[PDB]
Every structure is written in C-alpha cells, then in structure tokens.
Design a protein around this ligand. Structure first.
Ligand code: ZN
Ligand code: ZN
Length: 791
C-alpha cells in the first residue's frame, strides 16, 4: 500500500514537477500543491486496480490541468471551436474566444459576421493575430498537457496493469470510455489518445493499440469481453462503413504478439506447445459461415485466426530446417503431419498461401519453388492449382533490375540476340541509352552474365550456345567500343566463354552459391566499370591481389594486425560488434563488400589471398564464402526484411557505387597502407552507405515492382501468391469476405533485438535514448555478466 502510493507520487514528480521546473517555471507552486493532493487522495486506498482511487487520481490530474490553464491565460485556454483542437495561428475576439486564423477565414467570409459559439458580432475584420501572448500561452499549455498525459499513461501502464490479475471492470470501462470523446456540435464521435483530458483531439479517427497491448498481457479467456466491447464501439461509431481490413489486422497482430509474449516469458518446452497446437489443429471446425454476413468478425474468430497463423509459423520454421539437413526431431514431424492434415481437412487455401509466403519470407522464392517438384515431401504446402500451372522452366529473379529500365533494354536485346544470332539489337539498346559509358558498360556486362552464364548453369541450356550463337556475341564483344578496355572485354569474354573462375564457385548449398555468385559478379562489374576513388582499394582486393598484401583491410580489429585477421567463421563467439564509429548495418555492409572483393580476388589467384588471410593454409574460397554467409545472416537479422529483400538491399548498394562519381573522397592511399588510410576509407564508405540507407524505404517497393513484374517471373504462380499479387486468380478459396483477403494472410516480421538496434541507430539513439543505445551496443557481451559469480 505505502510503496504503491510513494511510486505514484514519484511518477507525478518525475513526469510533471521536474518538467515544470526545467521548462515552464510558472507552475511549480501549483504542482508542489498537487503532489500533496495526490498523496491525500491516495492515502485512503492506493489500489489503482480499483475504481474509486483511480477516478480520484484522474480528477486530481484534471483539475491540476485546468487550474494551470486558468493560471496561464485568463480563465480558460480552450481548444478552437471549429477545428476542435489547439489554435494554430491564434486570433482572439473581443468576446475572449481564441480561434485559428484559417478557421476564422474559412468561416467568417460569408454573411455570418458573428461568433460561432457565443453569437457575438465582430465589426471590422479579424486583422491582428497574437504571436506573443496567445501563441506562447497555447504552447506552454501544450507542454504542460503533454507532461500530464505522460504521467497518466505511465501510471496506467505501471500501476493499473501491474500484476498477473486484471484490474476491475469499472477501471477498464473507464479507460475504454476515455479512448473516445463525447459529442459537442456537428463533427462528432472523435477519438483521443488515452488521456483524461478532452482538448487534444484528432479530426480523423485513428486507432491506437495501447489498451490492447495492456489488456492482452492477461489470459485471453478473461479479457474477451473487454476487447469485444472496444471492437464493437469502433465498429458502431468510427469504422461503421469503411474497409475494416486494417482494424482487424491490428487486432490480429496484437493477439499474436500476446501469444508470443505468453510463450516466451512462460515456462513450457517445445513439446507441450506442439501437443497443444496439434490438438488445436485436429479439432478446428472452420465455421466461416457463422460470422460473415459482411462485417461481423468477433474477437473469438480473430483469435482463432491468430492461433492458426502461429501454427503455420511453427510449420514454416520446421520446414525451413527440415530441408536444411537431417531428421526433424520426431515431434516436429508429427506436428507437420498435423498441419498437413489440417490444410487437407479444412478447405481454406489461404492457410497454404500464408505458409508459402512465410517460407519465402524466411528463405526465398527459390527454396519454396524447390518444394513444387514431382514427389518432394513438402509439396502439400501449395494450393491446388499452383502445382499444375507451373512449367519445367522456372527462372531465377533477375536481381540486376536494381539498375532498371536501361538494364532491362540491354538484357532483352541480349536475350533476343542469343535466341537468334543477330547482335545489332544490343547496339541499338546501348546507343539509345542514357547514363553514360561506365553505366552502359556495367549494363552490358551484367546482361552478358545473366543471359549467357545463366544458360551455362542449367543442364538444358549448357553446350547449346556454342552452336553458332556465341560467335555473334564474341563478334560484338570484339567489335563494340562501349567496352573497349582490355581489362573489361577480357572479363566479357570470360563471362561468355565460361572461363571466368567465379562461375565455378563450388559450394554445397546450391541456393546460396547462386546468391554469392550474383553478388560477386556484380562487385567485379562495379569495380571494373566504376571510376571512383572509393573503389581503388577494393579493386586491388579483386583484380590485383598482390598489391594488397601488407595492407589494412576494412572492418578489422584495431588496438595491430594488417591483413584479414578474423578466425574461423564457425565459432561460438559474440557477434563481432561494430567498428570504432559505425552502426552495425554499415559495419556488416562494409565487411560484406570487403569479403566479396576478396572472394573475387581469391578466384583469380588464391596465393595472394593466402598471404593476406593470416591463420590457415588450406583454401580461401570456402573460407570467404562462409564469412559471406554469416554476414548475410546477420544482415537479415538487422534489417527487418525478408531474405530476398535483404539481397535486393545488397544489390542496390552495389549499384549505388557506380553512379556516385562525385569526388569528395581523397586523403587515403589506394593501397590502404596505414591505419589512417583505412579509417578514412571507413568514413567515406560509411557516407555512401548512409546515403543509400536513408533512402531505401522508397526504393525497395519500386525494385520489388521491377523484379516482380519481370516477364519471366510474373507468370509463375508462386510469384503471384507471394509478390504483390493476391492469390485470387485461384478460384478454390473463400469469396470476398472481410477476413479472407490477401492482406490478412500476409507475412510479417518477427521482431528481434538487432532490428530494434537498427531502429535506434536510424532514429539517432546516441542522443535520444543513450542508455538503450549503450545497452544494445553491448547486449551480447552483457548476457554474460550473469556468469560472473560462478567463475
Ligand atoms: Zn481551428
Ligand atoms: Zn465568442
């Protein structure tokens, strides 16, 4: 009792009183009074999980607020009567009412020369605006209202929802009531952001989820009706005639996050979870005719949907490691048998759509297309027509469409000029192309890679182009002066004659080696075609690896160990915390491009990369390729993306190192002979990486549009049930329901710690959340102070 009282008063002091002393010191004798008034209203019973003290604290905070407003600006700072919010560019009438300037110019200009509220005329014009008295009064009132809101929401989050038992019905109904505001005059039925106050009100109904995430920390069996009341209120006043997909999607997301919390913080193993969910799946009657006239989707139905999504997520996680390797622990096997029997019995193909999307979001499209074979024992995950509508010539995603619509022209001309044997169309696509000679040469080299070396990859198209199709290609390569550079057309011939020793990269995964091969060819093309001072060191890791022994490679440890001082990538260590001044994404991107240039170098001569890499004696290609694998896994963890989008990020960053021929990048040696040249490299390259990562949130959907609507991937139905297209070309799925659209059965991201570290780094966390920033920087090392008293 006494500590709940002391802690509530401490929340008030911390959020209101110290903010008043720091920012607006005209209200400190008011808030020091209301400390004592909170103490006296909590000394009877400081049990904020009940109704009476919670209403008492809320009333004390409300009259603290309005006495502060009357202390500011002469008996009643009020919101604008027209826009129902804070007055922007304030204008005060002689009837002591403050309005917005835009509201009083959009209202008073017809023949209604009066006041909207107190019906009092204004003679001449609303000419003076007050930028000193009323503007500062409204701003300081906004600050004090924000302090009181921070106190109230922190008090509700900490005291009302403290322990494992839920609070009473009256306090929860009070909270759900104060999500909404009353009607004043017609617009009505507004919303507000969990405040005891009424003046800060948005004009369009937004739907927060703070009380869902606070109520769902209890068991769902005892908070059904509260969420159903909140949903019924939202459906009867706010979104009564709308597209109610996103509201349902917010509720499904909150419910599945609550189940993630109660299985993570709960103490039960995988075996009990698999038994409980397997019992759930083999008794799930569909009942979709029960709640869908159009609009009724209760919270029991949404909870069954969220629980089905979690069963399918466990199925996706099991299938992503079943086909990684060996046997699958005999409980995961039985659970996948239950998921298969579930998808067979229940005739909803949206579960299989979500399962395909989730396997592709974890692994990629090629891994999922490997399940669509003629007897692969994971073929049940597809819906019914996707197996029959595929051909025997599934093609890979062209990830060089990052360049886009000038690469598209050259790859189409190259494809037709290897299809027939007429290589004038490549010259027509290049001469009608902007983005000058470095970019055009890179487009031509990547097109030659894509078409000709992807013909050598397949067992159908290999040993085919040697029959009089490579002769016109070789004649164009010898003839064309857009690649008249003897280090470039030697590379072009090595792509076409299949003599480039990157293409024999020799890995055992056969999905990853395609990714690493495409990235290494992209790196080698950028380092040949790009003319930039920030490509000269990596160039000597790739094309002249003997110059670059006794040289400090980027993202290496420093106290000093020149060369490549990293051990085996198959270690059990901490996750290689970032450099002297770098965020972990920029760190892993710099390390990944260094390793890709080193792989391109070690494919030419492995001896110079043996004398660069310090410990072993055996081989550099598999070593560097395992490092590239680990870097891609860490980059997938950090960026909250799918696998394919992370690879698009890498290819986009590689593309951006070519168009950036502005030179502000001097003052380091091209050999990187010192620490200082390496660190200046780090700085300029971090500048390019941050320019490209500030801007990728809008480039990623355009790149996914170019790669999804490529007319060699687009007709594939796996692509049409993953990328940007609903699965409603399939007829055998439920009709236009509110609950069975493509948006509800889409995949989302599991929220990791590295993703939150990435958000802290995006949102300037050194200066905004510095304890959290320092915590996330050293988190994997701080897991192990737990073992200090044992050692
Ligand atoms: Zn207004
Ligand atoms: Zn008035």
């Amino acid at each position: 009792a006494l500590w709940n009282r002391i802690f509530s008063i401490a929340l008030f002091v911390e959020h209101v009183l110290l903010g008043t002393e720091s920012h607006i010191p005209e209200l400190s004798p008011l808030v020091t009074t209301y400390v004592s008034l909170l103490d006296k209203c909590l000394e009877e019973d400081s049990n904020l999980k009940t109704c009476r003290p919670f209403v008492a604290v809320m009333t004390t905070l409300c009259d603290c607020k309005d006495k502060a407003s009357k202390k500011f600006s002469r008996f009643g700072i009020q919101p604008c009567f027209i826009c129902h919010g804070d007055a922007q560019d304030p204008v005060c009438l002689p009837c002591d009412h403050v309005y917005c300037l835009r509201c009083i110019q959009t209202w008073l200009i017809p023949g209604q020369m009066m006041c909207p509220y107190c019906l009092t005329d204004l003679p001449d014009k609303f000419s003076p605006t007050v930028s000193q008295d009323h503007r500062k009064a409204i701003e300081k009132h906004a600050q004090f209202r924000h302090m009181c809101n921070s106190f109230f929401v922190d008090l509700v989050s900490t005291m009302c929802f403290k322990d494992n038992t839920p609070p009473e019905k009256s306090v929860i109904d009070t909270l759900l009531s104060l999500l909404f505001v009353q009607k004043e005059l017609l617009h009505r039925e507004h919303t507000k952001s969990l405040s005891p106050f009424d003046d800060v009100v948005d004009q369009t109904p937004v739907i927060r989820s703070v009380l869902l995430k606070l109520l769902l920390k209890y068991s769902f069996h005892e908070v059904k009706d509260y969420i159903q009341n909140y949903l019924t209120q939202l459906e009867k006043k706010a979104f009564l005639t709308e597209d109610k997909t996103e509201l349902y999607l917010l509720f499904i997301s909150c419910l599945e996050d609550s189940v993630h919390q109660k299985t993570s913080a709960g103490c039960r193993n995988l075996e009990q979870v698999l038994r409980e969910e397997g019992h759930f799946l083999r008794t799930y009657s569909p009942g979709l005719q029960g709640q869908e006239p159009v609009r009724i989707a209760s919270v029991e139905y949404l909870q069954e949907v969220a629980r089905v999504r979690l069963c399918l997520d466990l199925a996706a996680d099991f299938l992503s490691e079943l086909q990684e390797g060996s046997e699958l622990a005999e409980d995961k096997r039985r659970f996948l048998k239950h998921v298969e029997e579930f998808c067979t019995r229940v005739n909803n193909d949206w579960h299989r759509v979500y399962l395909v999307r989730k396997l592709s979001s974890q692994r990629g499209m090629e891994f999922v297309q490997s399940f669509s074979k003629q007897g692969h024992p994971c073929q049940w995950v597809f819906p019914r027509k996707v197996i029959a509508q595929q051909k025997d010539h599934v093609s890979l995603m062209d990830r060089y469409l990052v360049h886009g619509n000038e690469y598209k022209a050259v790859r189409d001309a190259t494809a037709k000029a290897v299809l027939e044997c007429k290589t004038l169309d490549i010259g027509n696509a290049l001469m009608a192309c902007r983005s000058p000679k470095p970019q055009q040469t890179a487009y031509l080299l990547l097109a030659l890679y894509t078409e000709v070396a992807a013909l050598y990859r397949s067992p159908n198209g290999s040993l085919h182009p040697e029959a009089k199709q490579l002769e016109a290609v070789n004649k164009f390569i010898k003839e064309s002066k857009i690649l008249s550079d003897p280090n470039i057309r030697c590379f072009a011939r090595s792509l076409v004659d299949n003599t480039l020793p990157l293409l024999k990269i020799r890995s055992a995964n056969s999905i990853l080696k395609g990714t690493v091969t495409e990235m290494a060819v992209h790196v080698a093309t950028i380092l040949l075609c790009g003319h930039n001072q920030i490509l000269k060191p990596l160039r000597n890791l790739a094309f002249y690896p003997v110059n670059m022994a006794n040289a400090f490679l980027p993202t290496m440890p420093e106290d000093t160990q020149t060369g490549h001082v990293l051990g085996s990538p198959q270690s059990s260590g901490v996750a290689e915390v970032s450099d002297r001044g770098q965020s972990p994404v920029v760190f892993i991107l710099t390390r990944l491009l260094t390793h890709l240039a080193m792989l391109v170098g070690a494919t030419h001569n492995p001896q110079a990369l043996t004398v660069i890499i310090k410990p072993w004696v055996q081989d550099p290609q598999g070593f560097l390729q395992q490092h590239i694998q680990r870097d891609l896994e860490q980059l997938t963890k950090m960026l909250g993306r799918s696998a394919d989008e992370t690879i698009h990020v890498v290819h986009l960053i590689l593309s951006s190192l070519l168009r950036v021929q502005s030179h502000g990048v001097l003052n380091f040696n091209a050999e990187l002979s010192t620490k200082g040249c390496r660190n200046n490299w780090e700085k300029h390259f971090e500048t390019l990486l941050l320019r490209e990562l500030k801007h990728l949130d809008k480039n990623l959907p355009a790149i996914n549009a170019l790669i999804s609507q490529d007319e060699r991937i687009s007709s594939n139905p796996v692509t049409k049930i993953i990328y940007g297209d609903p699965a409603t070309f399939l007829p055998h799925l439920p009709q236009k329901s509110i609950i069975h659209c493509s948006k509800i059965w889409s995949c989302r991201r599991k929220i990791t710690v590295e993703y939150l570290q990435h958000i802290v780094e995006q949102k300037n966390g050194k200066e905004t959340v510095p304890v959290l920033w320092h915590f996330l920087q050293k988190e994997a090392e701080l897991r192990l102070v737990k073992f200090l008293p044992e050692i």
